[PDB]
């Protein structure tokens, strides 16, 4: 942080800390959580910040309630990452 | 603007000293004389094909293009057979070393060869004094359409 930072390669920790914007390259930290409902055996590629009452592919199960940031995954639901 | 009626004054108007021979029997009848203005400006077909007279036309009349050749966008088309060009430019001032955006208009005669609308860029040739202010004559409407045919967006 003083005099000779050597700015092309930071430690990744710093990058993680800083805003999703205020690193070297813009790169988001939202993920496509591949959710499975308790009902039907099928995987929904649910973006972690839904902004929607996320239904399944057809059945009205309700997977994720869109909280302002990351979605609360309604009830005992299971998920994969990205 | 206006146009259409052809022979519609108290007087009746022909191209002077130019003759529509009644003994002779051509298809055109009216022997349309026309001028090639030069300076690398084409005679528009509207002028050669049509009907209107105009003394003050540079292609079908006695006005001759010479001196300066200006261009400019058209502001007003409201008066009869003439246009108000608006010739935008920059004026330098050395005390500051910058520019102004300055105006000057040019009332110029338009031959019914051309269709001229508001906001059309128009090249104009100097000539005889036609009127009080009209010392200029339109030779080329550059913005023929300017997104006229391609106005609607839907596919």
């Amino acid at each position: 942080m003083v005099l000779v930072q050597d700015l092309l390669h930071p430690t990744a920790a710093s990058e993680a800390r800083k805003h999703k914007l205020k690193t070297l390259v813009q790169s988001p930290r939202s993920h496509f959580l591949d959710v499975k409902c308790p009902g039907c055996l099928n995987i929904t590629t649910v973006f972690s910040h839904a902004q929607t009452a996320v239904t399944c592919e057809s059945c009205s199960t309700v997977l994720c309630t869109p909280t302002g940031g990351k979605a609360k995954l309604s009830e005992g639901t299971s998920f994969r990452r990205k | 603007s206006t146009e259409l009626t052809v022979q519609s004054e108290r007087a009746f108007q022909k191209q002077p000293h130019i003759f529509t021979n009644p003994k002779a029997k051509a298809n055109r009848k009216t022997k349309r004389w026309y001028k090639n203005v030069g300076l690398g400006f084409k005679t528009p077909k509207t002028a050669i094909e049509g009907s209107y007279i105009d003394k003050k036309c540079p292609f079908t009349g006695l006005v001759s293009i010479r001196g300066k050749i200006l261009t400019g966008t058209v502001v007003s088309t409201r008066m009869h057979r003439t246009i108000v060009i608006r010739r935008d430019y920059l004026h330098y001032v050395p005390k500051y070393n910058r520019y102004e955006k300055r105006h000057k208009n040019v009332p110029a005669h338009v031959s019914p060869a051309f269709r001229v609308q508001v906001g059309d860029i128009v090249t104009v040739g100097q000539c005889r004094p036609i009127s009080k202010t009209v010392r200029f004559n339109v030779l080329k409407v550059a913005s023929a359409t300017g997104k006229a045919n391609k106005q609607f967006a839907k596919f």
Partner: protein, 129 residues
């Protein structure tokens, strides 16, 4: 708004120099800016510099040598008529001997001396002394 990106970059560089930083991070990273940097390098006022490709606009890093003193940018890109160049130099630069007045022209973004050599001037961008 972000007006004169180049100017901003130059300011940043100056600030860095003042601080005693060995390097600078620049956001926007233009063609003009790049040219300026190149010129500086040629002269001998700047180390490496590297354009990051934010898959977007740009993002430069400049290695400062500790040699830069000021890296100025004159505001509107004034129109210079070859004789006025001298006057400009007198105004901006310390000494007849050294420094440069980076001015864009038909030939390219070059310093004042270079322009003179060419016999081709244009609009000013900045300076380095």
């Amino acid at each position: 708004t972000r007006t004169s990106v180049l100017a901003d970059a130059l300011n940043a560089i100056n600030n860095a120099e003042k601080t005693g930083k060995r390097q600078v991070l620049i956001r926007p990273s233009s063609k003009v800016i790049i040219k300026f940097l190149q010129v500086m390098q040629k002269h001998g006022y700047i180390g490496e510099f590297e354009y990051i490709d934010d898959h977007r606009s740009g993002k430069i890093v400049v290695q400062l040598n500790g040699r830069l003193n000021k890296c100025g940018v004159i505001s509107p890109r004034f129109n210079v008529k070859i004789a006025d160049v001298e006057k400009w130099t007198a105004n901006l630069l310390p000494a007849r001997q050294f420094g440069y007045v980076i001015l864009t022209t038909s030939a390219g973004i070059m310093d004042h001396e270079e322009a003179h050599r060419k016999h081709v001037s244009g609009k000013i961008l900045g300076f380095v002394y």
